[PDB]
Amino acid sequence: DDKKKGKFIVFEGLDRSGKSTQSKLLVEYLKNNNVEVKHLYFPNRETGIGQIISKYLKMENSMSNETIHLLFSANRWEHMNEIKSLLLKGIWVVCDRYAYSGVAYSSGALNLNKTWCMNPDQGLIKPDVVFYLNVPPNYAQNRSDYGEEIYEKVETQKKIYETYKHFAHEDYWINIDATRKIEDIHNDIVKEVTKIKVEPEEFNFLWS
Amino acid sequence: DDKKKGKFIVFEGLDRSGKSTQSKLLVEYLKNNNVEVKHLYFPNRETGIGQIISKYLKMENSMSNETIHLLFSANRWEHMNEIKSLLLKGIWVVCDRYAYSGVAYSSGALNLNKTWCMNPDQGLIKPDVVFYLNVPPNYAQNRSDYGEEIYEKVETQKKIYETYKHFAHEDYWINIDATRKIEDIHNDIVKEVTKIKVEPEEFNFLWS
Numbered sequence A, B: 001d002d003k004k005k006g007k008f009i010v011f012e013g014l015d016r017s018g019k020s021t022q023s024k025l026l027v028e029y030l031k032n033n034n035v036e037v038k039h040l041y042f043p044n045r046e047t048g049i050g051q052i053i054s055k056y057l058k059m060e061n062s063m064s065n066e067t068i069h070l071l072f073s074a075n076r077w078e079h080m081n082e083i084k085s086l087l088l089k090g091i092w093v094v095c096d097r098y099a100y101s102g103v104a105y106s107s108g109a110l111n112l113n114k115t116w117c118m119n120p121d122q123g124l125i126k127p128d129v130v131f132y133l134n135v136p137p138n139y140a141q142n143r144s145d146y147g148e149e150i151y152e153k154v155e156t157q158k159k160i161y162e163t164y165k166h167f168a169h170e171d172y173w174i175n176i177d178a179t180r181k182i183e184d185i186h187n188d189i190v191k192e193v194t195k196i197k198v199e200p201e202e203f204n205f206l207w208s
């Protein structure tokens, strides 16, 4: 028996838009209602690949557009095992950033070619739902530690914001106004996650 | 002015089939007839990525099929700059292994999905010609240091040999019997490379 028992939820969004904050809250909420959950995020900067992705973002190095893109996708693929497993077991996975981030950022910030960009992530496990913490490009420039990494320039974030729309109208995509109080965002999130039916199912894969 | 002045030639083939030997010879031959040439090979195991690709082959680590595949492609992309440059300048590039190796090996040894496999290498510079040093899967098991790396098992090489055929009938593909004396292989190679017209041209990209 291999059906998919856990639930896989992804947060997406501009930089400094509260992805962590909201993923932590969703996690603790679920912990509270007795649902085993594992928090992951992407990129995972601890693996070999991650380490390279990391220097790239911190501008400790440079690499061509297509290399870093590929590196990002690879990084997700090295977690498909863990994820299938948790999900097989009934552990929900709350993830922050996934392939959506890949296409969005590469195609927006590095003028890559949307189909080209999706291609390598194609076949990755599809999540049950994506929460897009929607915020205006200039909004987050105020937050905590903005500007400390390669893509954290208003002009660039404006470019990215437009590419996120490439999923904006997709059934699993759930826009969320993220310019509000933390607990307002949190509650919308919960209301939507309760709508969910649990029930073992079959896995689905990007980009269906 | 950006037209492509050098010539780009790729050697392909099973393991221990004399790719190096023949690339060295072609290089020295060209050096002899006053043609600037830069020898490269793939994977390049010196870069960040390379280092990971390396442990993989030496079985010092493991990674999922799709990760290593992606890592291989990425590795080629980090050389598109160097290569375009040499070629722009009129430096010929003799390369040993390219995308053909990628599709061939991943799809054969790791049952990946041919289109999936080609997708990430799509857009890489197309070479002028591929010399496929054709040898039977059991032939090379005798050579120098066979078996010291992950794919060097007759049963696996048999699997790969069949996937190389995925280009076998392509105009740029040039089969070469490689079960012969070194200098016979060398001469066929030269005869074919002389056929070439030099003449600045436009670049072409896989997978056209």
Ligand SMILES: Nc1ncnc2c1ncn2[C@@H]1O[C@H](COP(=O)(O)OP(=O)(O)O)[C@@H](O)[C@H]1O
Residues within 6 Å of the ligand: A013, A014, A015, A016, A017, A018, A019, A020, A021, A022, A143, A144, A145, A178, A179, A180, A181, A182, A185
């Ligand atoms: N709704 C909010 N209102 C005010 N500050 C916030 C809000 N959400 C996040 N922050 C703050 O902004 C910074 C970025 O939040 P974070 O969740 O780390 O963003 P992301 O994970 O999307 O990069 C943090 O210091 C956090 O405390």
Ligand SMILES: Nc1ncnc2c1ncn2[C@@H]1O[C@H](COP(=O)(O)OP(=O)(O)O)[C@@H](O)[C@H]1O
Residues within 6 Å of the ligand: B013, B014, B015, B016, B017, B018, B019, B020, B021, B022, B143, B144, B145, B178, B179, B180, B181, B182, B185
């Ligand atoms: N035509 C040949 N006849 C006999 N031995 C060969 C021939 N070609 C290569 N070898 C030997 O086999 C080994 C593998 O050759 P190499 O060019 O390194 O293969 P590849 O680069 O394709 O892995 C080397 O030790 C080389 O000396």
Ligand SMILES: Cc1cn([C@H]2C[C@H](N=[N+]=[N-])[C@@H](COP(=O)(O)O)O2)c(=O)[nH]c1=O
Residues within 6 Å of the ligand: A015, A016, A042, A043, A057, A072, A073, A097, A098, A099, A101, A102, A103, A105, A106, A149, A150, A151, A152
């Ligand atoms: C996961 C992923 C992230 N990114 C970018 C988005 C983020 N922008 N910045 N800085 C950065 C990820 O770092 P943070 O998720 O910790 O904010 O990587 C990609 O370009 N492609 C990807 O596939």
Ligand SMILES: Cc1cn([C@H]2C[C@H](N=[N+]=[N-])[C@@H](COP(=O)(O)O)O2)c(=O)[nH]c1=O
Residues within 6 Å of the ligand: B015, B016, B042, B043, B057, B072, B073, B097, B098, B099, B101, B102, B103, B105, B106, B149, B150, B151, B152
């Ligand atoms: C360039 C490339 C090589 N390979 C394999 C072929 C070779 N098989 N072995 N062992 C190995 C490359 O090492 P050598 O080219 O030095 O023989 O990597 C791939 O699987 N994908 C690739 O994209």
